[PDB]
Amino acid sequence: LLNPKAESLRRDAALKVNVTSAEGLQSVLETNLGPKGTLKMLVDGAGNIKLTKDGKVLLTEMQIQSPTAVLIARAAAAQDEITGDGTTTVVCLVGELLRQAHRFIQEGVHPRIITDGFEIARKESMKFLDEFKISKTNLSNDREFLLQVARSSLLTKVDADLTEVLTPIVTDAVLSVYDAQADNLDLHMVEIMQMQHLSPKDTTFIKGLVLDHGGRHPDMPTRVKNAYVLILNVSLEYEKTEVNSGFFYSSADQRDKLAASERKFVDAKLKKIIDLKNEVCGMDPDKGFVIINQKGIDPMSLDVFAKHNILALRRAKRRNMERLQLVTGGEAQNSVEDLSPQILGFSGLVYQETIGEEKFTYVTENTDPKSCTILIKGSTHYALAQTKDAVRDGLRAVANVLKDKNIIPGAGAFYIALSRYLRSANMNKLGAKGKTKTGIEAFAEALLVIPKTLVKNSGFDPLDVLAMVEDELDDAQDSDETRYVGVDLNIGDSCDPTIEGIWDSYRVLRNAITGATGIASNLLLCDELLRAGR
Amino acid sequence: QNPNAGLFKQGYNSYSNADGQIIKSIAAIRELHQMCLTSMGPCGRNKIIVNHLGKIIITNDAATMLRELDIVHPAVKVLVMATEQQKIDMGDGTNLVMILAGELLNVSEKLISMGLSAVEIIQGYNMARKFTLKELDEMVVGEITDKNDKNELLKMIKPVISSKKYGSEDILSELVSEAVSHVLPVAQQAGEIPYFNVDSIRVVKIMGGSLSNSTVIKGMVFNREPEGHVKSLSEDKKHKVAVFTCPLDIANTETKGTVLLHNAQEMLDFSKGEEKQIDAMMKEIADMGVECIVAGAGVGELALHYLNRYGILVLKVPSKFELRRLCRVCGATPLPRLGAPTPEELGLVETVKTMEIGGDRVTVFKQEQGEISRTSTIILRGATQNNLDDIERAIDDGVAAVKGLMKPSGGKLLPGAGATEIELISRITKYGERTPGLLQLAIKQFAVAFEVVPRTLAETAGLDVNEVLPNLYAAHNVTEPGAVKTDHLYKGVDIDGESDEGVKDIREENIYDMLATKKFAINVATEAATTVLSIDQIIMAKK
Amino acid sequence: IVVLKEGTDASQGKGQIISNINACVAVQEALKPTLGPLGSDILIVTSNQKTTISNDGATILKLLDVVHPAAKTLVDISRAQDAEVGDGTTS
Amino acid sequence: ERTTGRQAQISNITAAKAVADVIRTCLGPKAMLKMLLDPMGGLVLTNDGHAILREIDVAHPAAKSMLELSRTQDEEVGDGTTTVIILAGEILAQCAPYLIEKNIHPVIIIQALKKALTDALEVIKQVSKPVDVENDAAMKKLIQASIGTKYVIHWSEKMCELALDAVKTVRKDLGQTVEGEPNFEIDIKRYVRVEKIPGGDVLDSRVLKGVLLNKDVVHPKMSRHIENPRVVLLDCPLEYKKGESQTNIEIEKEEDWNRILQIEEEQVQLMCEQILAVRPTLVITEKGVSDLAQHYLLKGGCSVLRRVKKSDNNRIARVTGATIVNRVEDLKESDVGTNCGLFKVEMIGDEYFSFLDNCKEPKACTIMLRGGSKDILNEIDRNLQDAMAVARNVMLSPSLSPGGGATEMAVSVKLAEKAKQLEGIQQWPYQAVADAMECIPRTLIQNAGGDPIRLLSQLRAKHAQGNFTTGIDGDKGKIVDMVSYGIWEPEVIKQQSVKTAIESACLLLRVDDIVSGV
C-alpha cells in the first residue's frame, strides 16, 4: 500500500513516536519551570544572545522539525494570547499526561477511553476549580497582598535580587494606571524603555514620562521644583522666507542685519514666549517655565533661554508629543500668535539627569498624568532582555489580579490537592465508567508533574517532599478544617501558600487544565502519521 | 541503522545538561582563562595579534585581545561582554574580571561532580558575594583625600602603570601625574560639578630620544606645520586667535553665488577680483588685533600670502574634535562665516611656537599661568615605536584610573599584590563556619577561587608556587591578644627581581589597587560566573 | 554546533615559545654566512623578479619579508641598527 | 510504462485499498484524528474525510478515481463521505482473493456484482421505515442530524426553518400514470442560492420569496416602495446611438457644441419616450444607462436599475412576468409588472438592496442570511447546505434507515441468506459483497475500542434472530436498539452509497490493463 514519494507511520508505533517526541520536549522545558529553574540561552546565529525562561518566547525563537512539538508550540502561542503566563506549565502537563497514558497504551487501552477519561476529569477539575478558588476583595489597599503577587511573578524570571528592585516598580505601575472605584486598567499607559551604561540594580520607576533628547547648553538648569510646561509646534531656530528671495549684503554688518531681520519673525515669537513667563508667576518662587518645543532651536535662542533659566528642548518624537498631552495636560500650541497662559500645563519637579552620552528629562510629579514609565537599566543587551521579559510578564500578572477578582494559592496547592481529590473522588463517586477509571487515574497522576518538577530543579528529593505534603493533607482532612498546603522550595518542607505569599492567577490555571487536556487528547486521537514530499 | 536520540530539531546540535555542557562550557572558558593567567601582573606575558588587514601588533591587555578575537561560542561571549562592562565605568580590571570569573567556574566543577545542584551553587555565590562586598567596606586601609597633590597622584598612578609597562613605572609616573594636575582645578568641598574629562589629556609620541627627554606642557599640541611664513609668535603674553570654519578665500553670497565664465574679459576680472577682495578681507581681519588665524578648512594661495605680510600665523586644523578642545583653552569660538572676527569671539593665548621634537618641527599651543587651560598634552619620546605605542595605552588607562577617583567613594583603597586576596580568603572562611547549612561547601570554594590571583603573580614571576603559598598563609594567620589582628595586614605577593627570600609590605613600594575597582570587578565577575552556570542548554535556530 | 574561532588560528603554551625560537633560528641560520667582511653572500629573488646579491644584513633581511610575527622582531632591530649606526645589521 | 496481465489487477486493488485505509478511522463521531505532513512543512490534524484526501496527492490512476468518486458523491449527500469510500474499497478488497487466489474471471465477478446490487437495494427498502415529510416537528429532528456538533446547534430551530421554507418553494409534488411522476425533484443549487448579508442576528435570517439584487437605484431620492409596479426588462442600453457610417464628432468652434448636444439629448429622449408610453413604474436595463436617460426617466416617475445580469433577468421574469426584449423599440405589450408585491430600496448594513418579492412562490426563493460577522455567515452558509442536503434526501423519498451499522449489518445477513439458493460460480464473489457490508460497523467498533470479533459476532447473530433495527451506539459502543437511540439517516444516503460502490467496484474490475503515454 504505497505510491512513489510517500512515507506513513500506520500502526500503534506511530502514536509511540508522537508521545516520545513530546517526551523529548518535556525534558528540555522542565528545567526552566519555577523560580528554582534554569535560564536558557538562545543564539540566532548572528551573535544575538537572549536569556528568557518563558516557554513561548523560547519556542517562537526555535525551529522544531518534530511535528508533535509544533502543535505544542502552537498551543503555547494561544496560552500567552489568553493567560500570558504559564506556557511552560502547559508543556509539562501535556507531556506527562502522554507518558502516563503511554503506560496504558501499551496495555492495549484504546485512546478514546483515555481521552474521554481526561474530559470527564477535566469537568470534575472545573468543579473543583470553583470550590478551591479564593475570592479576593476589589479593594486597592491590598498592596501588601500585591507584594506577594509581585514576588510570584518576579522570582521566576530574575535572580531574586532584582525582585526587591522590581517589586515596588511593578506594583506602583499597575495601581497608578488603575482607575478608582473598580474600573479597568490600561497596560499601554505604562511605557517600557531600556537604557545602557548602568547596573540592573539601579532600575527605577518613573511616575511621569521620560524623553530621550535633552536640552543642550551648559547653563541649562539642573532641576526645577515647579514649572509651567509649554507644548509648542513652532520652530524657534533660523528659518527662511516663505517666498523665494535672497540676501545681498555690502558689508559684514549688513549680513547680520539681514540675518536678524529674518530671525525677527522668530524673535517676535520668542519675545512673546519669554514675556509669558513674567506674565504669570514671573517673580513668584517655586515657579518655572520649560520649552519642550518640537522643531529645532538654534544656539542663539538657547543662549537667550539660558539667561532666563528656561529649559529648551528640541527635536522631539511626534508620538511623545501626544503622550505629553495626557501626562502633562498642556495643549499643543500650533502658533505663537494664539499662545495664551490657559494653554500651558502644570508639572512638578523636572530635573535633568546628566550622563555623558545620554541626557534624560523627567516630566514626573504630574497632577493627572495617567501614564507611567518603567526605565530598565543594564550594561549589556541580554541584561535588558531578561528584565524586560520579567516586567512585561509582571505587569500582566498583576493586571489579571485586579481584572479577575478570583485568586488561587500557588506552590502546587491546586495541583497536589486536585490530584488527591480526583483519586479519592472517583472511588467514592463511581459515576463515570469502569474502563474510564484508567483515564481518571492517569490524569490524577499526571497532575503531580508540576510539584515534582519544582523540587527537581531545586534538587530536593521529590518522593520525600511529596510524602510530607500527603501527610499534612491527611492530617488536615482528619482534623475537619480547611488548610491550604504547598511545597516550600527553599527549606524543603511543606508550607502554607497563603502565608508564604505564593499565588497563581485564576485565569492562568483555568485555561491551563483545559488547554493541556485538549491538546494532549488531540495527540492521542492521532491514528496515523502521513508524510508527503519527504 | 543506528538511531539517534535527543535531537528532534532541524538536525541541529543542542547539548542537554545530562551531557554535561556546563562542564564543557567551563572547559572552553578554561582555554581563554589560561590566556589571561599569563597577562595580569608586571611579570606577565605579551601576546602578538596578527590582524586580518596585514598588521602585526602586540599587547598585554586582554580587553584589546577580546576585541581582536572573533567570539561566537555562547559561554565565552558572556565574559567578553562582561569585560566590556569592566571597560566601562573604570579603566582598570580587564585582567581582573577575566581571571576571577574564570576561576569561579573552575571551582564550580568540583561541586558539579559532587552532585551539588547548579542553582544551589549560584545561591552559594550570591550569599558569599554579599558577605564579601560588605567585608571589603571594612577592609579599607587608607582613603584618598582628593587633595589633587602631585605626590598624592604618584601614589595612585604608580601601581596602575605596573602590570602593563614595567621598568617605566617610576619614569611614567612623573609624566602622567604632571598632566593630570594641570587638568585638575583647585577646589574643595564641591561635589556638584563633575570634572577631569579623559579627552582633556592628549598623548602624542614622536620617534627618537627616550623617556628621559619626555616633558609635559600645558595646552594642545598639533602635528601640522606653520603654513604661514611666520614660524612662531613673539614672547608677549595673550595673543588673539580667531577660529574660522569658513575657508580662507574670497567670500561668497548666501544665495546662489555660482562662478560662471563666458569671455576671457571676465577671467581677467576674476583674478583681479579675488586679488582685491581677499586683500581687503585679510586686511580688516588682521586690523581687528588677531595675530593668529586657525582655519578649520582649506587656505587659499592669495589668502595665505596676504596674512604673511601682516605677520599672521596660519595654522590649519581640519579636525573638529581638536577645535572643540581648543575653545576650552584659548576661549575663542568658531565662526561659520569669514571677515568678521568679533573681539568677543576672539580668544587669548600667551605662546604659539614651533618646536623640534624627535627631529621634526611641530607647532604647539600652550600657556604659562594665564588664560587657564582645561586641556593638557603629554609629549612622549622613544626609540621603538611599538613599545612607545604601548606606553600610550598605559597612560590612557592611568588617566581613566584617576577618573576612578570621584565622589562615589573612589578614594578608598586596599593593599594589592595579593595582600587583600589572601586576607579575604581567611575572612570568608570565617563566614563559612558561622553560616550553617549546605552553603558551607559553596562558601569555602568561593574563598579558594580567590587563590588564583596570588598564584598567578608567583607563577609568572618565576617563583616557586609551593614555597610562596604557605608564606602568604603564615603571614596573614597570626595569634594576637585580642579580637582585632593588629600590626601588619600588609604582606603581599612579592615580585622580587632581587635574590634572597620572602614577601614584602605594601607600605614599602606603595603598590595597591583602589577599592572602587576591586569592589566593582568582583560584583561583575561573580554575576558573570553565576550567569554561565545558569545556562544548562543552548539552542540555535534560523532567524 | 557553535565554534570559538570562525577560522582564527591561535596557539599557546610552552611549546609555542620554543616554536617561536625555531622560527628565529631559521632566520638566523640564513644570516650566519654573511657575518664579517669575508662572509658569504646570499642570493635573493624578490617577488618583483629582480635578483640582487649583497652581504649587508640590512638590505638582505628587508628582502626576505618574513611572515612569521616573532621573527619580524629581528627586522625591527635591523632597522634600528641601520638607523643609530648603519653598519653591523648582520651581527 | 505499461502494466498488463494480473499485475494491473494487483495495482488496482492496492490503490483502492490504500485510499480507503486512510479514512477507515475517519468514520463516526468518535473518529480518530489524522496527521498529514505537508511537503511545505505544515501539517493538518483535522479528521474531516474530504479535507484530508483533498490535500493528499496520489499517483496510481485508480487512486484518482476514488477521489473523483467522493467529489460526485458529495454533490448527492452532504455527509457520509467516508462511508462510501470504505464500502467501495472493501468490496474490491473482499473480492481480491477470489480474483487472484481462486482465479475467478473478472467478468464473472462483475456480472455477480450487478445481481448483488439489485438484492442489496431491495433489502434496504425492506429494513427502511416510512416517515411523514409534511410533519414540521419530524423534519426538524431529521435535519438536526446535520446540525449538532456545530455552532448552529443553538439556532437549530431557525436553521431548519431556513431549510424547510426553501425546499417547500422549489418542490413540485405530483404523481399519476398519465404524465409520469417527477419523484419529487428539488434543485438546491440554482434556485435556492443563498445571499449572505453582514450584520444583524441569526434569528433575523429570513427566507425571501423572489430575487435579490445588490445594485442600488441610480438616483438618491426615489420612491421607496411601489404599490402596483410595472416592470420593463430590456437588453440594449439607453444612450445616444451611433450611425452605420464613418461619421465622427470633433468639435472645435465653441458654438458647435450645442448642435451635437441637442441631438444627443433628443435621441436619448426618444428611447426613454418609448419606455414611458406604457407608463412603467420600474425600468431595469441589462447594460448601462446614460445620465441623460436617468434624468428623462427621473421626471417620468419610474425607478431605473442599471447593469443587471442576463441570468438575473430570467429569474426576474419568473417573479414578475416581464417579457425579455432585446431592442428598446421592440418592447412588447406582453411585458407586465403583475404579481410583484413591492420594490424595496431598504439598506441593511450600509448596503443598498433591491426586493422584487411578491406574495406567490415562483418555484424559486432567495435565502437572506444574517449574523455577527463574515466568519459567522460562512459558518451558517456551509451548515445550511448540509441542513438542506439532509432535508433534500427526505423530500426525495419518504423513508428512513437505521444507522450506526444497523443497515450495513442487516444487509450482510440478508445477502448471506439469499446466497444459499444462488448456487453456481457467481455465488463466490456474491458472498464477498456481504463480507464487505460488515466493514462499516467494524470500523465503528475499532474506533470505539471494543472487541471487534466479539461484538460483530453478537451483532450479526442479533439480526439473525432479533429485529434488523438493532445497531451499534456511537458514544458507547455496545449493541443497542435504534428504537431507544434513533440515529435515523435518510435512505438516500444508503441508496447512493450502495449504488456508487458497486459501480466503482465494477469500474476497477473492468480495467485489466494500464498503459502510460500519449
Helix/strand/coil (H, E, C) string of A354-422? ECCCCEEEECCCCCCCCCEEEEEECCCHHHHHHHHHHHHHHHHHHHHHHHCCEEEECCCHHHHHHHHHH
At residue D24, the 3 state secondary structure works out as helix
Residue appearing with cell numbers 544656539? A299
Give residue for cell 464613418.
D246
Q: What are phi and psi of A124, to 5 degrees?
A: -70, -30
Cβ proximity of B331 and B371 under 8 Å: yes
Residue D83 falls in the annotated catalytic set = no
* Partners of A8 in beta bridges: A530
Whole-angstrom distance, CA of residue D466 vs CA of residue D455:
15
- Which amino acid makes up residue B242? A
Among chain A residues, CA nearest to D61: A3
CB A364 within 8 A of CB A206: yes
The 3-class SS string of A105-117 reads: HCCCCCHHHHHHH
3-state secondary structure at position A31: coil
Q: Which of A 19-58 lie inside 8 A of B, CB atoms?
A: 21, 24-25, 27-28, 31, 36-49, 51, 58
List C-alpha distances in Å: C7 to B52, B64, B463, C3: 11, 19, 37, 9
- Which among D24, D32, D34, D35 is the top mutation candidate for probing chain A, defined by the most A β-carbons within 10 Å of its own β-carbon? D35
Whether the CB-CB separation of D401 and D230 falls below 8 Å is answered with no
Cα B172–Cα B178–Cα B182 angle in degrees, nearest 5: 150
Q: Which helix (H) or strand (E) holds D3?
A: strand D2-3
Q: Pick the residue of B12, B35, B50, B66 with the most C CBs within 10 A to test the interface with C by mutation.
A: B50
Residue length of chain D:
518
Distance from CA of B452 to the nearest CA of C (A): 18
Phi and psi, residue B377, nearest 5°: -135, 135
Minimal CA separation from A30 to chain D, in Å: 26
Residue with C-alpha cell 415562483? D362
Location of C-alpha cell 477539575: A125
First to last CA, chain C: 51
Fold designation for D210-357 = GroEL (3.50.7)
Q: How many CB pairs under 8 A join B and C?
A: 36
Is residue D451 annotated as a catalytic residue, yes or no? no
Closest approach of chain A CAs to the CA of D120, in angstroms? 29
Q: What is the rounded distance in angstroms from the CA atom of residue A261 to the CA atom of residue A243?
A: 15
Q: Which is nearest to D92 in space by CA: D168, D191, D10?
A: D10
Q: Which residues contact D33 (CB under 8 A, 6 or more apart)?
A: A522, A525, A526, A527, D45, D46, D47
- What is the CA A154 to chain-centroid distance, rounded? 10
Class of domain A137-207+370-405: alpha beta
What distance, in Å, lies between the first and last C-alpha atoms of chain A?
17
Q: DSSP for B69-120?
A: S---SHHHHHHHHHHHHHHTT-SS-HHHHHHHHHHHHHHHHHHHHHT--HHH
Note which residues in 1-40 of chain C have CB less than 8 A from chain B. Answer: 1-6, 8, 10, 12
Q: How many CB atoms lie within 10 A of CB D106?
A: 17
Q: Of the listed D335, D357, D386, D473, which one is catalytic?
A: D386
The answer to whether residue D82 is catalytic is yes
Task: Please classify residue A469 by burial: count the beta carbons closer than 10 Å to its beta carbon, then call 0-12 exposed, 13-18 middle and 19+ buried.
Answer: buried
Cβ burial of A153 (10 Å; 0-12, 13-18, 19+) is: buried
Do A207 and A365 touch, CB atoms closer than 8 A? yes
Rounded Cα distance, A49 and A36, in Å: 22
Residues B512, B415: contact at Cβ < 8 Å? yes
What's phi and psi for B315, nearest 5 deg?
A: -135, 115
Secondary structure string (H, E, C) spanning D105-138: CHHHHHHHHHHHHHHHHHHHHHHCEECCCCCHHH
Which chains have 3+ CB pairs within 8 A of C? B
Element housing B329 (H / E)? helix B320-330
DSSP D288: -
d(CA A172, nearest CA chain D) in Å? 40
How many A×D Cβ pairs under 8 Å? 68
Delineate the domains of chain B, giving CATH numbers in brackets.
1-143+412-543 (1.10.560.10), 144-218+371-411 (3.30.260.10), 219-370 (3.50.7.10)
Least CA distance to A519: which residue of chain D? D45
Q: Write the DSSP string, B400-448.
A: HHHHT-STTT-SBEEETTTHHHHHHHHHHHHHHHHS-STHHHHHHHHHH
- Asked whether A386 and A414 are in contact (CB, 8 A), the reply is no
The domain ranges of chain A are 1-136+406-534, 137-207+370-405, 208-369
Give A533's contacts in chain D (Cβ within 8 Å): 38-40
Neighbours of A366 (CB within 10 A): 21
Whose cell is 515647579? That residue is: A226
Which of chain C's residues have a Cβ under 8 Å away from the Cβ of B383? 80, 84
Residues 6+ apart with CB under 8 A from D485: D473
**Relative orientation angle of helices D452-465 and D406-418, to the nearest 10 degrees:** 70
Dig out the grid coordinates for D320 from the structure: 414578475
User: CA–CA separation, B474 vs B486, rounded Å?
Assistant: 15
Cell of D468: 434488523
Residues 6+ apart with CB under 8 A from D342: D225, D226, D227, D229, D355, D357
- Listing DSSP states for D465-490 in one string gives HS-TTEEE-SSS-SEEETTTS--EEE
Q: How far is CA A295 from CA A141, A155, A291, A317, A318, in A?
A: 44, 44, 11, 10, 10
| Chain D positions in Cβ-Cβ contact with residue A4 (cut-off 8 Å) | 59
Q: How far is CA D373 from CA A192, D153, D196, in A?
A: 35, 18, 10
What residues contact residue B267 under an 8 Å CB cut-off, 6+ apart?
A: B261
For residue A136, what is its C-alpha cell? 479576593
Query: Phi, psi at residue A85, to the nearest 5°?
Result: -150, 155
The type of residue at A472 is E
Q: Hey, which bits of A253-293 come out as E strands?
A: 289-291
State how far residue C60 is from chain B, nearest Cα, in angstroms. 21
What does chain C come to in residues?
91
All cell numbers assigned to B235:
614672547
- Contact between A530 and D39 under an 8 Å Cβ cutoff? The reply is no
Residues in chain D closer than 8 A to A525 (CB atoms): 32-33, 47
Touch D-B: 3+ C-beta pairs under 8 A: no
Q: How far is CA B146 from the centre of its chain?
A: 20
Q: Report how far residue D480's alpha carbon sits from residue D138's, in angstroms, rounded to the nearest whole number.
A: 23
- Residues 6 or more apart whose Cβ sits within 8 Å of residue B150: B177, B178, B181
Distances (CA, A) of D216 to A304, A478, D193, D304, D305: 66, 77, 20, 9, 7
Task: Please answer whether residues D353 and D373 qualify as being in contact, where contact means their C-beta atoms are separated by less than 8 angstroms.
Answer: no
Residue with cell 606575558: B45
Residue A387 CA to residue D455 CA, distance in Å, equals: 62
Question: Which single residue is written with the C-alpha cell 622580587?
Answer: B496
For residues B491 and B474, give the distance between their C-alpha atoms in angstroms, rounded to a whole number.
10
Q: Cα separation of D44 and A101, whole Å?
A: 23
Buried/exposed code over C30-62 (b: 16+ C-beta within 10 A; e: otherwise) = bbeebeeeeeeebebeeeeeeeeeebbbbebbe
CA distance D446 to D442: 6
In the block, cell 494487483 appears at: D10
Cβ–Cβ below 8 Å for C4 and B74:
no
Long-range contacts of A247-251 (CB under 8 A, 24+ apart): A247/B253, A247/B254, A247/B255, A248/B253, A248/B255
The DSSP code for A438 is H
CB within 8 Å: A38 and B535: yes
Q: d(Cα C58, Cα C60) in Å, to the nearest integer?
A: 5
Measured between beta carbons, the chain A residues lying within 8 angstroms of D30 are 112
Is residue A109 less than 8 Å (CB to CB) from chain D? Answer: yes
* The one catalytic residue among D25, D81, D366, D407: D81
Q: Identify which of C6, C12, C80 has the shortest CB distance to residue B70.
A: C6
Dihedral pair phi/psi, residue D104, rounded to 5°: -95, 135
**C-alpha span between B269 and B299 (Å, rounded):** 21
Q: Is C72 on the interface with B (CB under 8 A)?
A: yes
Question: How big is chain A, counted in residues?
Answer: 534
Measuring CA to CA, how many Å separate B253 from each of A51, A259, B266, B284, B433? 59, 13, 18, 19, 84
How many C-beta atoms lie closer than 10 Å to residue A129's C-beta? 19
CB contact under 8 A, A159 and B126: yes
With CB atoms and an 8 Å threshold, state whether A66 touches B16.
Answer: no
CB neighbourhood size of B270 (10 A) = 13
Residue A109: CA count within 13 A, CB half-sphere: 23
In terms of Cα–Cα distance, which of D285, B39, B41 is closest to B49? B39
Distance CA(B476)–CA(B421), nearest Å, equals 10
Q: How far apart are CA A487 and CA A416, in angstroms?
A: 9
Q: What is the DSSP string of A80-127?
A: HHHTSS-HHHHHHHHHHHHHHHHHHHTTT--HHHHHHHHHHHHHHHHH
Q: Which CATH number fits domain A1-136+406-534: 1.20.1630.10, 3.40.640.10, 3.20.20.70, 1.10.560.10?
A: 1.10.560.10
* CB B332, CB B341: distance < 8 Å: no
Of D14, D39, D448, the CB nearest to A532: D39
d(CA D61, CA D86): 18
The shortest C-alpha distance from A41 to chain B (Å) reads 5
CA distance A84 to chain D (A): 25
Burial D405-439 (b: 16+ CB within 10 A, else e): bbbbbbbbbbbbebbeebeeebebbbbbbbbbbbb
Do D52 and D32 meet the contact criterion of CB atoms below 8 Å apart? no
Q: Which helix (H) or strand (E) holds A444?
A: helix A436-446
State the cell numbers at B195.
Answer: 570634572
Task: Name the catalytic one among D82, D83, D320, D366.
Answer: D82
